[PDB]
Amino acid sequence: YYLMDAASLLPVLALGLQPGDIVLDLCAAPGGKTLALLQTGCCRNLAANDLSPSRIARLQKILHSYVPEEIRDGNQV
Amino acid sequence: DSSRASLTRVHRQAYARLYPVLLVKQDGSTIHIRY
């Protein structure tokens, strides 16, 4: 499980996500919402972007540690 | 040359038995469709 504020989970629920949808997340790092988008499983391709490579590093870490390599594959994330 | 392309086997690994079922619905036209 991932411990996070349940408030931050609401905007993901606000998206009417359907299978085979392409999701852009302009500010991804450190994560939380991105992980939730991945947990939905309705997204075909994921776009994760953040200006600071310092923060994207921890984003990389959390998605590596939580999400298996099988789901990453090639440009799905 | 319709005949060569008409009879073909589907390249799906798993499928149910396909019988050439006749397709007429008050159209006067005969069509052989695998169902």
């Binding site: - | 040359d1 319709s2 392309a5 008409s6 073909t8 086997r9 397709l23």
Partner: protein
């Protein structure tokens, strides 16, 4: 080395570059449509006709018919003559033959390798 007459023998990226019709082939039978799509695609490859995609949108809800599409490009008006005649003659079983166009209202997900040089030229 620049001054030596062998210069730029290693040049490679100059040889590469770092920088429309849609054909409908609907049939009720699911053993037929893709076979003819294959055939048309093979004809296109032989006569140097550029192909984009062979996309398939889902079966209509119930009875049930499914649509197979081939995207083609690079066709001349003169060469169309020969090409369209063959694809009409080769029609297997009452398959609706359509020629649809991109109407500027019909964007792609760019790959990571493609994006870097795009960013470099953007700024």
């Amino acid at each position: 080395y620049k001054t030596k007459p062998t210069h730029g023998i290693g040049k490679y990226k100059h040889l590469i570059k770092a920088e429309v019709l849609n054909i409908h082939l609907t049939a009720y039978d699911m053993t037929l449509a893709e076979s003819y799509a294959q055939y048309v695609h093979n004809l296109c490859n032989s006569l140097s006709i550029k192909v984009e995609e062979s996309y398939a949108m889902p079966t209509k809800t119930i009875l049930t018919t499914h649509e197979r599409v081939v995207q083609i490009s690079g066709l001349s008006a003169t060469f169309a003559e020969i090409f369209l005649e063959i694809i009409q003659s080769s029609l297997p079983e009452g398959v609706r033959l359509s020629v649809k166009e991109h109407t500027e209202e019909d964007g792609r997900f760019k790959a990571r390798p493609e994006l870097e040089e795009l960013l470099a030229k953007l700024k």
